[PDB]
Design a protein around this ligand. Structure first.
Ligand SMILES: OC[C@H]1O[C@H](O[C@H]2O[C@H](CO)[C@@H](O)[C@H](O)[C@H]2O)[C@H](O)[C@@H](O)[C@@H]1O
Ligand SMILES: OC[C@H]1O[C@H](O[C@H]2O[C@H](CO)[C@@H](O)[C@H](O)[C@H]2O)[C@H](O)[C@@H](O)[C@@H]1O
Ligand SMILES: [Fe+3]
Ligand SMILES: [Fe+3]
Lengths: 192, 192
């Protein structure tokens, strides 16, 4: 059966951007629930002995919602670090300048995509077939993991549980937090 | 320009089922924002002189998400009451018995529709063209108001901001509060 991965850092490590309480609900409860629900839908079925990724790339309805959500959250914990934040570095820093002209223009373009991402959703930094970086929004459990030629680089969870405890309704406050946490090492790893 | 309607009861009137703070943010901020946004989008478009309902029934993209959310939230506040809850009465009570056999079968049916309504969404009690009752789910800003010959009777908001402050991730606890606040008079007024 699938397991809930351990968080890549201590539960208070993202303070004060993301609270210890948010992490216990978000990772300990929400992410956990997608794991048990998936574990509850696959016994006996054809997805029974497939990896998480084979499942999200070949499933539907409830099996897809849960498997994609487990995958999205794991990627999300990885896009954050108590050692991240600030200016981008390496390959991704230059790729960002190539597409948007400057990091600041990129921040503004992602923030705009994120605040207007209606309902439960995800905003992704992705690498396209032509080697270039782009920003795409998915809704509910959808993920670019399933689009040919699109490689997920970083993600920001915009479902309301991702920030309500800490920022209530103001997404820009949450996004300011994200930027202080962005894991550029994870980004560069996915990009290369 | 559209206006945020007043809450139909005091900000603490739904306690201990839905808190003063949820009402302050849910009505005071979330609902308001849909109003400001919609007002921001109408000038220079055909929706220039239309009624809220005319817009939601003939709109698309952003004009629709904002207008429908205003309509939906107005409908939701009316669907609760410091004096609701408990058993259904009058015509609605009997139609529920006609369709589901018992109030309890109906309640279990709606809870199941609601807890499984994935992402931001609404679970609705509607009166169909053939006169009978049914339960339908909509996602994000969708609403039965646009379904021809389908009459909205009661709704429960399942976007996370509707309950996260008071119940975090557990929708069933939120649903317990909803059944303690159901406004059967509004349901009967809408059904009649
Ligand atoms: O896993 C159960 C089902 O989840 C989804 O359907 C629910 O959520 C939808 C909105 O996201 C509602 O419209 C629907 O009424 C709910 O049943 C999924 O779409 C289904 O395929 C799953 O079986
Ligand atoms: O009002 C702004 C737009 O809202 C919707 O589009 C946003 O939300 C979608 C998810 O619900 C995203 O996929 C999309 O990227 C966002 O722009 C609406 O569909 C648009 O028509 C509105 O213009
Ligand atoms: Fe999440
Ligand atoms: Fe709401």
């Amino acid at each position: 059966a699938f397991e809930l991965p351990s968080l890549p850092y201590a539960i208070d490590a993202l303070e004060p951007h993301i609270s210890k309480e948010t992490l216990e609900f978000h990772h300990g409860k929400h992410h956990n629930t997608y794991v048990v629900k998936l574990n509850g839908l696959i016994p006996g079925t054809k997805f029974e002995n497939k990896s998480l990724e084979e499942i999200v790339c070949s499933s539907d309805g409830g099996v897809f919602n849960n498997a994609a959500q487990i995958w999205n959250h794991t990627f999300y914990w990885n896009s954050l670090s108590p050692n991240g934040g600030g200016a981008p570095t390496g390959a991704v820093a230059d790729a960002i300048n190539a597409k948007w002209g400057s990091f600041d223009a990129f921040k503004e373009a992602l923030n705009d995509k994120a605040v207007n991402n209606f309902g439960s959703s995800w905003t992704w930094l992705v690498k396209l077939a032509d080697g270039s970086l782009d920003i795409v929004n998915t809704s509910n459990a959808a993920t670019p993991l399933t689009d040919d030629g699109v490689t997920p680089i970083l993600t920001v969870d915009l479902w309301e549980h991702a920030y309500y405890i800490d920022y209530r309704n103001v997404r820009p406050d949450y996004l300011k937090g994200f930027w202080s946490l962005v894991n550029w090492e994870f980004a560069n790893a996915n990009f290369a």
